[PDB]
Amino acid sequence: GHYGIHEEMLKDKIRTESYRDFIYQNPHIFKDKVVLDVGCGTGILSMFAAKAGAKKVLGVDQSEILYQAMDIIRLNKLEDTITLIKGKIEEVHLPVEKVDVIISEWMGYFLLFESMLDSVLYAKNKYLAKGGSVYPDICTISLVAVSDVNKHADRIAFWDDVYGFKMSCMKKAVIPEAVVEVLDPKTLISEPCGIKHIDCHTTSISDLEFSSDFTLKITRTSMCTAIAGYFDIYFEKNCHNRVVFSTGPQSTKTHWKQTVFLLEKPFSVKAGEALKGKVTVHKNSLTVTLTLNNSTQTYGLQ
Amino acid sequence: GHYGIHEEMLKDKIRTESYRDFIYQNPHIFKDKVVLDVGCGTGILSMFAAKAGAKKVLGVDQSEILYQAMDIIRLNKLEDTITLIKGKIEEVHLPVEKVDVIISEWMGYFLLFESMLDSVLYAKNKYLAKGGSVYPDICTISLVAVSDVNKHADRIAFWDDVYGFKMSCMKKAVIPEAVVEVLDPKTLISEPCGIKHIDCHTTSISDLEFSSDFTLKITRTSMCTAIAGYFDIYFEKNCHNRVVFSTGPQSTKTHWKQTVFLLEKPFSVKAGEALKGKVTVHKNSLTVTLTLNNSTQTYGLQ
Numbered sequence: 001g002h003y004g005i006h007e008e009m010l011k012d013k014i015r016t017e018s019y020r021d022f023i024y025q026n027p028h029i030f031k032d033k034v035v036l037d038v039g040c041g042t043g044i045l046s047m048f049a050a051k052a053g054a055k056k057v058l059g060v061d062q063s064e065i066l067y068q069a070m071d072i073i074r075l076n077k078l079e080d081t082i083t084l085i086k087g088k089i090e091e092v093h094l095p096v097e098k099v100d101v102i103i104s105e106w107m108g109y110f111l112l113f114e115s116m117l118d119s120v121l122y123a124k125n126k127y128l129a130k131g132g133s134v135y136p137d138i139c140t141i142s143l144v145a146v147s148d149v150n151k152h153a154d155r156i157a158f159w160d161d162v163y164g165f166k167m168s169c170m171k172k173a174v175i176p177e178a179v180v181e182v183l184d185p186k187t188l189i190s191e192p193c194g195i196k197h198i199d200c201h202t203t204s205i206s207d208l209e210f211s212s213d214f215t216l217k218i219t220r221t222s223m224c225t226a227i228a229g230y231f232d233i234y235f236e237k238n239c240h241n242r243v244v245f246s247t248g249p250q251s252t253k254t255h256w257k258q259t260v261f262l263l264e265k266p267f268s269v270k271a272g273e274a275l276k277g278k279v280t281v282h283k284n285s286l287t288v289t290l291t292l293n294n295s296t297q298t299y300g301l302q
Numbered sequence: 303g304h305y306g307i308h309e310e311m312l313k314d315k316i317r318t319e320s321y322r323d324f325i326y327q328n329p330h331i332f333k334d335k336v337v338l339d340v341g342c343g344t345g346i347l348s349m350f351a352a353k354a355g356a357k358k359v360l361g362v363d364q365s366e367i368l369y370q371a372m373d374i375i376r377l378n379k380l381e382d383t384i385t386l387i388k389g390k391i392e393e394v395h396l397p398v399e400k401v402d403v404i405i406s407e408w409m410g411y412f413l414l415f416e417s418m419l420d421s422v423l424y425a426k427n428k429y430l431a432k433g434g435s436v437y438p439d440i441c442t443i444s445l446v447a448v449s450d451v452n453k454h455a456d457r458i459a460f461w462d463d464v465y466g467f468k469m470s471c472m473k474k475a476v477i478p479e480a481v482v483e484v485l486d487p488k489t490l491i492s493e494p495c496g497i498k499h500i501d502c503h504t505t506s507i508s509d510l511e512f513s514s515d516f517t518l519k520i521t522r523t524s525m526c527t528a529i530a531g532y533f534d535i536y537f538e539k540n541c542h543n544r545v546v547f548s549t550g551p552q553s554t555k556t557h558w559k560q561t562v563f564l565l566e567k568p569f570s571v572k573a574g575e576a577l578k579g580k581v582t583v584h585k586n587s588l589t590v591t592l593t594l595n596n597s598t599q600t601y602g603l604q
């Protein structure tokens with residue numbers, strides 16, 4: 001219901017200008033089409049689609065924000081193009097059988113933490129016309145190795161001596177919590193490894209639980225203290241002007257930052273080493289099981 | 303139950319070293335005394351009190367954190383001095399009728415947002431021995447005038463043109479939300495004005511709802527865009543070594559930062575001007591009614 005999350009999303013220029021660039025630079029995708037905006041929030045993506053020449057835009061949001069979207073759409077005189085419907089996309093009555101295009105910003109931290117993709121996929125299976133399109137269409141998840149003994153000490157070792165007192169028992173509560181923060185790209189000590197490719201046209205709900213064996217190509221002899229996760233978002237299908245953005249630490253920071261899994265036992269790596277591990281994602285919410293250097297830890301996102 | 307709030311509090315050096323300095327530099331207050339730590343969290347203040355020579359420390363917390371405190375107190379071999387009790391201080395059974403000293407860190411944003419002072423005062427009225435002491439004993443709240451057109455534009459004007467679209471209807475949701483952030487002390491355009499003095503020995507619950515007429519002594523000709531609130535914490539009673547810390551923007555930042563009330567209509571002020579207003583605090587939670595320059599706004603803290 002609250003606007004704070006909407007302000008954070010809207011003020012992310014990488015996020016919001018990627019969507020704008022996609023829609024405005026590929027207007028043939030929207031021209032005289034019926035568009036569904038799943039979880040439309042303030043309705044900005046619905047308005048971009050109307051500006052690109054949409055015949056009709058259905059903006060669906062379950063929360064109080066939809067009342068603000070109703071006012072925003074009237075303030076921009078688009079009420080003849082954009083219809084707003086309050087409710088879960090799984091429950092609402094749409095005034096059409098099918099839609100030509102689905103658009104959504106459904107992505108969570110590490111792509112899948114508190115993500116809306118389940119609801120986007122429900123909307124796809126129920127409402128997308130034969131030969132229609134869903135955007136963004138292609139997503140990847142990547143891991144990269146990190147060396148940051150100081151950040152590791154600030155989070156873990158800290159608990160050994162707190163103003164003269166032992167609190168070492170606190171570390172077992174800290175290690176299993178993934179950290180969302182922007183990484184200094186100087187602390188990256190491997191090439192990235194892709195662990196997941198999603199095409200929204202063909203992926204099912206069951207595909208979003210997955211396991212990947214990975215190889216981190218180590219680029220610096222150092223103490224590996226953490227594995228960082230991030231994701232890349234692609235607008236491809238039928239585009240003359242393809243759009244991509246990365247939430248990786250080598251790219252301009254976004255509100256998604258990067259997801260960091262601290263190692264209980266940091267371990268030394270060598271430039272040239274092929275560091276092999278296994279990662280598994282499970283839902284209910286989201287957990288990430290990591291095996292590396294012959295130990296295993298499951299992480300969750302608070 | 304969660305450790306994140308405990309880590310934030312413990313990593314605030316101003317907060318935690320003020321309490322440490324108070325207890326270690328005034329050990330006569332603790333020497334062979336019975337001490338009650340209201341909402342003890344990880345039990346750090348209970349351990350400082352045992353180190354200063356407390357005969358017995360009762361640490362009370364309602365949340366899961368108390369189980370970690372039990373382990374922490376054993377890890378530092380203080381289980382013969384510190385007894386930990388899980389539950390609301392309003393409900394738990396204490397193994398004593400009375401205590402000599404009550405200590406607590408109960409303070410919220412703007413002192414009173416999501417504060418524990420109600421529970422500290424219940425503990426005082428029920429458990430403090432005749433002639434005992436409560437720490438910290440003295441609190442003040444202050445207001446100061448702010449000029450920051452750029453921050454005001456980032457929060458308010460922003461909504462007028464969002465990637466070509468009007469969202470001006472969003473401003474009425476934004477203005478009533480107080481912002482918690484660290485202020486550039488360069489943006490302060492008045493002397494502070496005190497609006498509230500609390501002595502924990504004598505204040506009742508009813509005193510924490512209050513009204514104050516105030517005068518801001520303007521020190522710079524500028525556009526007044528906001529009023530900032532903060533608080534000062536005093537350890538006085540029976541101290542040889544008095545301790546104070548301020549959460550004001552002229553002082554080292556704390557986890558409490560400063561509370562900022564944006565003006566809907568910024569207005570020009572002159573150096574030398576005595577700017578008069580009225581502030582009122584109400585509970586349930588907390589709201590702050592501000593009258594200044596012939597308009598009134600009620601603010602809450604999200």
Ligand SMILES: N=C(NCCCSC[C@H]1O[C@@H](n2cnc3c(N)ncnc32)[C@H](O)[C@@H]1O)Nc1ccccc1
Binds near residue numbers: 041063
């Ligand atoms: N950028 C993010 N992006 C994904 C999630 C944002 S929720 C975005 C919007 O979608 C709405 N919504 C959620 N589930 C459904 C549903 N089943 N049916 C209809 N409306 C729904 C919700 O009311 C909200 O306004 N997340 C994020 C944002 C800030 C910080 C961290 C992550």
Ligand SMILES: N=C(NCCCSC[C@H]1O[C@@H](n2cnc3c(N)ncnc32)[C@H](O)[C@@H]1O)Nc1ccccc1
Binds near residue numbers: 307311343364407
């Ligand atoms: N520094 C802060 N300081 C005040 C509040 C912290 S709560 C501090 C601790 O007190 C416990 N507690 C709260 N009410 C009661 C009760 N009635 N009876 C027993 N135990 C209680 C709570 O489980 C928690 O561990 N607040 C703060 C912290 C971080 C960010 C912003 C404000």
